[PDB]
């Protein structure tokens, strides 16, 4: 429990419920064997696609990671899906996400527009209901990026240990988010609890000591994740870290929370 004492609740209870939550939300790095017509690389291409459309429409990272987590949780419920309706399943996931997370989401037709007419507004509305019925309407996961937001606040604490008004640097967040974004494109990531992936990514940009202070997790807990993440880590350092953009109409105290895209194409293949 890396939270300091909370005014509103038992810091331990808050943290248990959040850990307790992660447990009632299953994931499977080996769900694409339920669909033996499908190749692991297909998923990466798709999630790479969502990130693109998220940047254009200035959607939050939380929105992207909800889409990802709706995708991979949904497929695990299904059987023998074909490449054909991967665009529909993903853009419909982003649609649900965007409606959950944004104050003023895009409108249904924008989600059909991007599809280049491979998906109709009313295919989207059909799929969204099957996805939501299939996930038993459990649409409130702790995303990979949501743990990075936790950790970054805990790292930047003072006297009156307020964990709620967000106080941390935007450029460090951007740089760790880049490493997590690349890591997600590869289904092997779903081996590691989302808490651990975020913890493990921060470790690469800091130390086992900071990681423990902010996450709780002991070196052994993240040890294997850290080892798996190594190749994605070095590949991001070989190229240099990216810069915090300002976004049009998006304020500045909110500019790190906007999802972004660079050519994470070849970058994943080195690994």
């Amino acid at each position: 429990s890396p939270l300091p004492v909370l005014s509103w609740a038992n810091r331990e209870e808050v943290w248990k419920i959040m850990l307790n939550k992660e447990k009632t939300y299953l994931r499977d790095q080996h769900f694409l064997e339920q669909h033996p017509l499908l190749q692991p690389k297909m998923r990466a291409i798709l999630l790479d696609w969502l990130m693109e459309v998220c940047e254009v429409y200035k959607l939050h990272r939380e929105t992207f990671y909800l889409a990802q987590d709706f995708f991979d949780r949904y497929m695990a419920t299904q059987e023998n899906v074909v490449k054909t309706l991967l665009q529909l399943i993903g853009i419909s996931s982003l649609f649900i996400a965007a409606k959950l997370e944004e104050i003023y989401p895009p409108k249904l037709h924008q989600f059909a527009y991007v599809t280049d007419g491979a998906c109709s507004g009313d295919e989207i509305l059909t799929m969204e209901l099957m996805i939501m019925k299939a996930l038993k309407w459990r649409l409130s996961p702790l995303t990979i990026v949501s743990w990075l937001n936790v950790y970054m606040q805990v790292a930047y604490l003072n006297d009156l240990h307020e964990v709620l008004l967000p106080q941390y640097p935007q450029q460090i967040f951007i740089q760790i988010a880049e490493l997590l974004d690349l890591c997600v494109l590869d289904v092997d990531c779903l081996e590691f609890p989302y808490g651990i992936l975020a913890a493990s990514a921060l470790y690469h940009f800091s130390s086992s000591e900071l990681m423990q202070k902010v996450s709780g997790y002991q070196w052994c807990d993240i040890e294997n994740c850290v080892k798996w993440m190594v190749p994605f880590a070095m590949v991001i350092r070989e190229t240099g870290s990216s810069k915090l953009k300002h976004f049009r109409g998006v304020a500045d105290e909110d500019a790190h929370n906007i999802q972004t895209h660079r050519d994470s194409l070849d970058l994943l293949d080195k690994a």
């Binding site: 005014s7 309407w137 709620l164 105290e253």
Partner: protein, 298 residues
């Protein structure tokens, strides 16, 4: 589809949607049914319906009105809820001559704080706490309802929708245009509901954003950088706001002992940072008779 469900009466229509009392006539099991016309819904399952269903799935508590099922039929989405017979405005109206007896007030508040403390520990803000949204049954229970304006907050919180809480139950930090907010807006609402239960009247019946602020000021005093650090730097704060003096709490809630007046004032602290928590309220001396011994370790 809609199998064993006989509609018995329309309970209402009003932002929450269309809601009917229904009987499982096989079982004599009474539910509340919320009907969502998908066909007339441009943007598909409404954002407010997706958020309320996922939130209530993971909010199982005795003082939170349960979501029993979600049935998709015929371009209709049906939300099936636990059913409670009356809401607290109608109860308070029906009780305005006799008063609500102080045992029931204490009990009802205590229970509401237990629901609210469950939501907050689960990082959920209600954001629309008013008597119309507090449902009572025939066994002395009260429960939170309408999670359509509710929202999960991040441990490190983010800027949330600014159009929240109906005007009379709205916290001063929201009226003055605060950037961030969290658990304290819900506590201001219960504070307003507490006094209302006591006085048989809305505590702060404003007819506009500015009139609400002024009614708040007239009762609790125009705030300054002493009682509420940052207040003078807030977007909708105006150096011109008149200067009124806080009022004795023995005359704004006359029926109320030492402990009540304590509880309510801490529930109505101007500074969101100081406003009591739901958890801490449950541990108040006002409740000393209801709350009992526990231990602690390191």
């Amino acid at each position: 589809p809609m199998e064993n469900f006989q509609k018995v009466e329309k309970i209402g229509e009003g932002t929450y949607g269309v809601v009917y009392k229904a009987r499982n006539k096989l079982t004599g099991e009474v539910v509340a049914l919320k009907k969502i016309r998908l066909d007339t819904e441009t943007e598909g399952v409404p954002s407010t319906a997706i958020r309320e269903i996922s939130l209530l799935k993971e909010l199982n508590h005795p003082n939170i009105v349960k979501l029993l099922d979600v049935i998709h039929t015929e371009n209709k989405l049906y939300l099936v809820f636990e059913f409670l017979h009356q809401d607290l405005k109608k109860f308070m109206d029906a009780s305005a001559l006799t008063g609500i007896p102080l045992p029931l007030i204490k009990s009802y508040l205590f229970q509401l704080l237990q629901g609210l403390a469950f939501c907050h520990s689960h990082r959920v803000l209600h954001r629309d706490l008013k008597p119309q949204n507090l449902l009572i049954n025939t066994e002395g229970a009260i429960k939170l309802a309408d999670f359509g304006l509710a929202r999960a907050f991040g441990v490190p919180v983010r800027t949330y929708t600014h159009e929240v809480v109906t005007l009379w139950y709205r916290a001063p930090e929201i009226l003055l245009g605060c950037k961030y907010y969290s658990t304290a807006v819900d506590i201001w609402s219960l504070g307003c509901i507490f006094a209302e239960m006591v006085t048989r009247r809305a505590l702060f019946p404003g007819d506009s954003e500015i009139d609400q602020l002024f009614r708040i000021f007239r009762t609790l005093g125009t705030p300054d950088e002493v009682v509420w650090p940052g207040v003078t730097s807030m977007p909708d704060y105006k150096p011109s706001f008149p200067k009124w003096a806080r009022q004795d709490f023995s005359k704004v809630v006359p029926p109320l002992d030492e402990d009540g007046r304590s509880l309510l004032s801490q529930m109505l602290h101007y500074d969101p940072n100081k406003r009591i928590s739901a958890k801490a309220a449950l541990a108040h001396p006002f409740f000393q008779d209801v709350t009992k011994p526990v231990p602690h370790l390191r």
